[PDB]
């Protein structure tokens, strides 16, 4: 232990130094420091420390001082080698102790900062608990590895932020301002009776503010943008929305908004606001930024972190290569009587090991399927059946426990971990019935669900799930402890920094002067906020804390939380995943038809036919009583489509044969579509053109594009891959359904029926629970009053395992879970009005669910998918499973052409002036100055802001003139140098197109005085300037390689994109048919609805990333009590205000699943390709 070559003052031979070393290494010192620091962390968790623990704080302080004294008397001063100043964490020790000695006396006035700086004490655990330093180190190498991807992410967000700034400059401010200026009564702010523009335009009660919403409505002058009501105009007027932080009006806020788009955090609101202000035609920009900045950049970050973690993991795995016995023998051994031993032998034989497992597992499955059947509205007979089945099942398990206990000695019985788990379960089961009148405590009955896990001995894959959960707290218990410590330190930093601010500035974020739902005042709520930031919803609370406690502090804190917490959660996820991983005319006619089928031109013709027939569905929307000529021509072309497809069916039959045709799935698909279309045809041709299931069969025409699945090769290959991978996914989905069934039954036991309201919707306030506690007095209020007071139910409730699965899929997708958790934590009793956060600790139920059934199940599912795709790749020699054969040739062409090319260096021409000009153009100095002026142009682009002074506009105009002149002069110099050989490299061609297009932009800026005044095309040709800053990637190497990886991986993305677009098309037609004419309630507005193909594809693309799909679903699930079953609906004979709930849930659940399986394969096609690069 000693090993002391120190040889310092206070000689190492001294008694005091030897005693200090002896006590220092001694493990009881480490244990008492553990106790001290854990109690310190708890007292930090304490919000307002009462003065009767101020001395306890001094006690802790003194313990730290004693430790510091010991470490100083054991090689203290920095001069000597191997001192404690060489070890970095002792810098933290000295810092925290010295700052405590600063704190307890007079100090600086920033009390909050000095109070916060105590978090180093909690950080000490990272230093002192064994093994954590290595975990932090590994995190450090992974971060060090992801540098190039950080650089490319920064420059890509910069480019896209400039695009968004130049396009949506100020558009977010567009508000419906009262236009018919009422001069005669336009008072001034100081009572002048005069009218000032800058006061009228910013007066907050001159805006619209759609009744019910908070922000004033965004509006727009474009043909497709939002629509001002009658008596308003669309001038930009006042502060931006979301307190002013959602804006493109400056490069800072544009960068914030596009970092928000990158992580897709609440990006559907930016989507809706910007499309409502600037017009729906700008959805192209959002598609471009979601398929580049969101999917691709996040995929690249995850792939690089995964590569680094795999490299480090493989490197670190490769580098390695009696006293109680005597009491037990008397009491744990139950052989004391000969007849007792005979009974033991008998019952051990009566176990029937081959026929005991089946009986017990059958009882477990029947028990879980009895616990599934639960409701709030329960008939007394049904609850009696549930109770008697509960008693029967618990009796069966008690019988098994006692039988095994008597059959095998309790020593060897408890010697099995499975048996100790069974004993825990049976004890928990028995303590229920005896305690049948305990107040509250409905959580206890939920522990019975763990019996299902006894099927782990049966399933290998449920064993894999248990293996993952064990490795979380087993081999990686130290890393999950690092995660817990970090989620603790951030939780307490937030509470010490913004905790008092959230209470001082309450009326700035919540209009009722109450604490917001998710604040940082207590410790529980601060932990909830940091957990939410780990889930992904940072922006919606960053706005609030910026509004209460300064922008800079929240920006720094929340960026730190995101980066560090997401790094640690990602590392934990990959740690778990890598732990898991390891005559003679019939024959001639047949062959002639075969030949006519196999003709390429004919296939192209049928492709065009299916495209036209499928696109003819788009025109069938609510704007169909207009353009009656279009409806008539398309209806009469529907007949010829049916004819040509029946003809194709018949001719394919003749060409192939009935057996050959009906043994193909695609041919069954085509036959089914043609048959249903023809059945509808004959039905409409006959008098039975309506009044039956024929109309409901009419909407099935949306399945017509499926023929493109058979025809188009890329979609066929992708669907082939997905279907082939389904069998390895069925078992994992069974595990996920069983485990989410456990969670859903527990949720039902906790919440069933505790999700009811009493709106007085005239005021639409959820009655505070002192006017109406019970449901019964809410009925009293009804019977006294009229329907203007109701007893609503949260629509995504937990009231049976079906609604449980729905609400729990919402909670697990992190969309729509906020209302569920609000109505849960407000829930108190089954027939009692909810009270605001009267059950706050039900939050931990959703925390547990997100940890287990959304994180661990996702980990299992992803691991199985990766294993399956590794297998499938290994089957066909490692080739890709998302490319056609010609796409494979394309792939190999880039694989060969991506190498190092010995390009011609353009030998010098035979002129001295040409010699010197090529010395100029070939010198590295000329390149680097070009890059620096590109950077200067980039900064002078980002400095352009809304509401900028006209002088600044002129200065920017002239500096842009200077820069474009410089670039054009360089271009023409290189042309005079060698035009013909400088038209050889594509980079130069990009330069020429950008310079000529910038010249076009500036000429048209000068000559906008013409007959073709177009501001929008003018902003686009301004965006054309941005292309020049893309030349910086030429001077980069890793960024160029990564862009090459994207280029090389495009074809698979293209095939999956065709499949995803075709799925969007089918579901959009289904929405146009069903979910048109639905109430515009929440997430379905006057725009972003299903009333047209454009709006429907808008909504489907929003849902493809799961964003706000609760919003779209919610107005569907309402009922004629909360609807109008016979609405006027002018301009169309269709009636009814809301659709069918059942098809609403099937439409969105099946899209979320289908889209999830599609977008996942997009990730894999990207992630695995990046691995194969190196």
């Amino acid at each position: 232990f000693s090993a002391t070559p120190a040889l310092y003052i206070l000689s190492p031979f001294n008694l005091i130094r030897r005693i200090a070393i002896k006590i220092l290494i001694h493990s009881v010192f480490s244990m008492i420091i553990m106790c001290t620091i854990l109690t310190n962390c708890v007292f930090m968790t304490f919000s307002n420390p009462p003065d009767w623990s101020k001395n306890v704080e001094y006690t802790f302080t003194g313990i730290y001082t004693f430790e510091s004294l010991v470490k100083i008397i054991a090689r203290g001063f920095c001069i000597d080698g191997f001192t404690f100043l060489r070890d970095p964490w002792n810098w933290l020790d000295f810092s925290v102790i010295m700052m405590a000695y600063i704190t307890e006396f007079v100090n600086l006035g920033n009390v909050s900062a000095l109070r916060t700086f105590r978090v180093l004490r909690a950080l000490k655990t990272i230093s002192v608990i064994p093994g954590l330093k290595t975990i932090v180190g590994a995190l450090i190498q992974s971060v060090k590895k992801l540098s190039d991807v950080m650089i490319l992410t920064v420059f890509c967000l910069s480019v896209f932020a400039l695009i968004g700034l130049q396009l949506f400059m100020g558009n977010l401010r567009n508000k419906c301002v009262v236009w018919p200026i009422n001069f005669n009564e336009s008072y001034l702010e100081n009572g002048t009776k005069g009218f000032d523009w800058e006061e009228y335009i910013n007066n907050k009660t001159n805006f619209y503010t759609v009744p019910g919403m908070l922000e004033p409505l965004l509006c727009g002058n474009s043909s497709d943008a939002g629509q001002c009501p009658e008596g308003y105009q669309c001038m930009k007027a006042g502060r931006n929305p979301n307190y002013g932080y959602t804006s493109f009006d400056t490069f800072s806020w544009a960068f914030l908004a596009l970092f928000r788009l990158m992580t897709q955090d609440y990006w559907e609101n930016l989507y809706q606001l910007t499309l409502r202000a600037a017009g729906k035609t700008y959805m192209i920009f959002f598609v471009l930024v979601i398929f580049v900045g969101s999917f691709y950049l996040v995929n690249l970050i995850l792939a690089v972190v995964a590569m680094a973690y795999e490299e480090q993991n493989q490197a670190t795995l490769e580098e390695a290569e009696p006293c109680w016995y005597k009491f037990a023998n008397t009491f744990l051994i139950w052989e004391c009587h000969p007849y007792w031993i005979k009974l033991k032998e008998i019952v051990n034989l009566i176990v029937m090991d081959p026929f005991v497992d089946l009986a017990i597992t059958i009882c477990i499955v029947l028990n879980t399927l009895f616990m599934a059947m639960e409701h709030h509205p329960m008939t007394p007979q049904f609850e009696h059946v549930l109770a008697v089945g509960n008693l029967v099942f618990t009796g069966i398990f008690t019988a098994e426990m006692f039988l095994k206990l008597i059959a095998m000695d309790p020593y060897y019985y408890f010697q099995e971990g499975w048996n100790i788990f069974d004993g825990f379960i049976v004890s928990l089961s028995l303590m229920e019935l005896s305690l049948a009148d305990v107040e509250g405590l409905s959580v206890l009955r939920s522990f019975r669900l763990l019996r299902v896990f006894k099927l782990a001995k049966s399933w290998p894959t449920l064993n894999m799930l248990i293996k993952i959960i064990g490795n979380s707290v087993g081999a990686l218990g130290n890393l999950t402890l690092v995660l817990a410590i970090i989620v603790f330190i951030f939780a307490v930093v937030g509470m010490q920094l913004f905790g008092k601010s959230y209470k001082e500035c309450v009326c700035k974020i919540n209009q009722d002067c109450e604490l917001p739902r998710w604040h940082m005042h207590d410790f529980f709520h601060s932990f909830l906020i940091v957990f939410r930031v780990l889930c992904g919803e940072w922006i919606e609370t960053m706005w609030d804390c910026m509004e209460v406690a300064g922008q800079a502090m929240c920006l720094i804190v929340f960026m730190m939380v995101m980066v560090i917490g997401n790094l640690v959660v990602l590392n934990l996820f990959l740690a778990l995943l890598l732990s898991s991983f390891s005559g003679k005319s019939w024959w001639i006619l047949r062959k002639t038809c075969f030949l006519i089928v196999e003709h390429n031109w004919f296939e192209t013709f049928i492709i065009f036919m299916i495209l036209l027939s499928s696109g003819a569905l788009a025109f069938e929307d609510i704007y169909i009583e207009q353009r009656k000529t279009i409806r008539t021509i398309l209806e009469y072309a529907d007949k010829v489509f049916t004819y040509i497809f029946i003809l194709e069916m018949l001719l394919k039959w003749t060409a192939y044969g009935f057996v050959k045709f009906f043994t193909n799935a695609w041919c069954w698909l085509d036959f089914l579509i043609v048959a249903v279309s023809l059945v509808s045809l004959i039905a409409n041709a006959l008098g039975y053109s309506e009044l039956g299931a024929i109309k409901s069969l009419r909407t099935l025409r949306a399945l017509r594009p499926l023929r493109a699945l058979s025809r188009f090769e890329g979609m066929r290959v992708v669907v082939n891959a997905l279907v082939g991978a389904i069998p390895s996914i069925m078992n994992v989905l069974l595990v996920c359904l069983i485990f989410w069934l456990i969670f859903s039954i527990m949720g039902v036991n906790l919440f069933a029926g505790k999700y009811h309201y009493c709106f007085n919707e005239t005021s639409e306030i959820r009655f505070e629970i002192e006017d109406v506690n019970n449901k019964t007095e809410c009925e009293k209020l009804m019977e006294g009053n009229n329907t203007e007071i109701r007893w609503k139910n949260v629509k995504i409730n937990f009231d049976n395992v079906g609604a449980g699965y729905l609400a729990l899929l919402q909670v697990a997708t992190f969309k729509g879970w906020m209302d569920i958790m609000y109505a849960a934590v407000d829930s108190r009793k089954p027939d009692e009005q909810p009270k605001y956060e009267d059950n706050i600790y039900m939050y931990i139920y959703f925390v547990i669910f997100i940890i287990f059934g959304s994180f661990f199940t996702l980990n299992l599912f992803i691991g199985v998918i990766i294993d399956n795709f590794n297998q499938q790749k290994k089957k066909f020699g490692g080739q890709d499973i998302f490319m056609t054969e010609e796409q494979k040739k394309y792939y190999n062409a880039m694989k060969k052409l991506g190498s190092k090319k010995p390009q011609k260096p353009i030998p010098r021409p035979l002129n001295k002036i040409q010699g010197i000009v090529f010395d100029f153009v070939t010198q590295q100095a000329f390149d680097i100055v070009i890059m620096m002026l590109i950077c200067l142009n980039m900064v002078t682009m980002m400095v352009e802001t809304d509401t900028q002074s006209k002088q600044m506009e002129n200065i920017l105009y002239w500096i842009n003139l200077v820069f474009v002149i410089f670039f054009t002069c360089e271009c023409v110099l290189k042309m005079f140098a060698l035009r013909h050989y400088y038209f050889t490299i594509g980079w130069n061609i990009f330069d020429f197109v950008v310079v000529i297009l910038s010249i076009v932009g500036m000429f048209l800026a000068d000559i906008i005085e013409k007959y073709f005044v177009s501001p929008t095309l003018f902003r686009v040709i301004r965006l054309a300037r941005i292309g020049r800053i893309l030349r910086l990637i030429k001077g980069a190497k890793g960024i160029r390689t990564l862009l090459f990886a994207l280029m090389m991986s495009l074809p698979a993305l293209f095939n999956i994109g065709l499949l995803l677009f075709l799925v969007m098309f089918i579901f959009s037609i289904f929405g146009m048919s069903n979910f048109a004419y639905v109430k515009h309630e929440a997430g379905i507005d006057d725009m972003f609805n299903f009333e047209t193909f454009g709006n429907s594809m808008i909504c489907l693309f929003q849902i493809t990333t799961s964003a706000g799909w609760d919003g779209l679903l919610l107005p569907i699930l309402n009922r004629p009590p909360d609807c109008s079953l016979d609405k006027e609906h002018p301009g169309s004979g269709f009636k009814g205000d809301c659709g069918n709930p059942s098809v609403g849930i099937f439409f969105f659940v099946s899209y979320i699943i289908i889209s999830f399986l599609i977008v996942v394969n997009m990730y894999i096609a990207i992630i695995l390709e990046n691995f194969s690069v190196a």
């Binding site: 001082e504 500035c505 309450v506 009326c507 700035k508 002067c513 209460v548």
Partner: protein, 120 residues
């Protein structure tokens, strides 16, 4: 109450100037119309309290016989200063200054205490 900071104890010479402020820091930077500040003076701890200075949508001085034309408000509510200065201090002014403030948009209505004594 309200986050109001004041000089805990101030000493003033006979007949010399004395400025006793009530600085305060709150959310919702102070507006002028809906804002209100009050000033109460007590000639001693357990005796009567007397209103002498108001600001309800405008500066309103009650002009008591104790502070006829001596207490003047030259503070800055926007700069979070509602200070009162007492020129020609007289020993029967020894007592308690209490400033009452209400920041409109918050409801953290609070109080203020100042103890002033005059030296012989």
């Amino acid at each position: 109450s309200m986050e109001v900071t004041v000089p805990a104890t101030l000493n003033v010479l006979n007949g010399s100037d004395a400025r006793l402020p009530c600085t305060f820091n709150s959310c919702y930077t102070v507006n002028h119309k809906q804002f209100s500040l009050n000033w109460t003076y007590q000639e001693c701890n357990n005796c009567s309290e007397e209103m002498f200075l108001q600001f309800r949508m405008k500066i309103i001085n009650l002009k008591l016989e104790r502070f006829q034309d001596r207490v003047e408000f030259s503070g800055n509510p926007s700069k979070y200063d509602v200070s009162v200065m007492l020129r020609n201090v007289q020993p029967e002014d020894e007592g308690i200054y209490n400033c009452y403030i209400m920041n409109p948009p918050d409801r953290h209505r609070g109080h203020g205490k100042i103890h002033l004594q005059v030296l012989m």
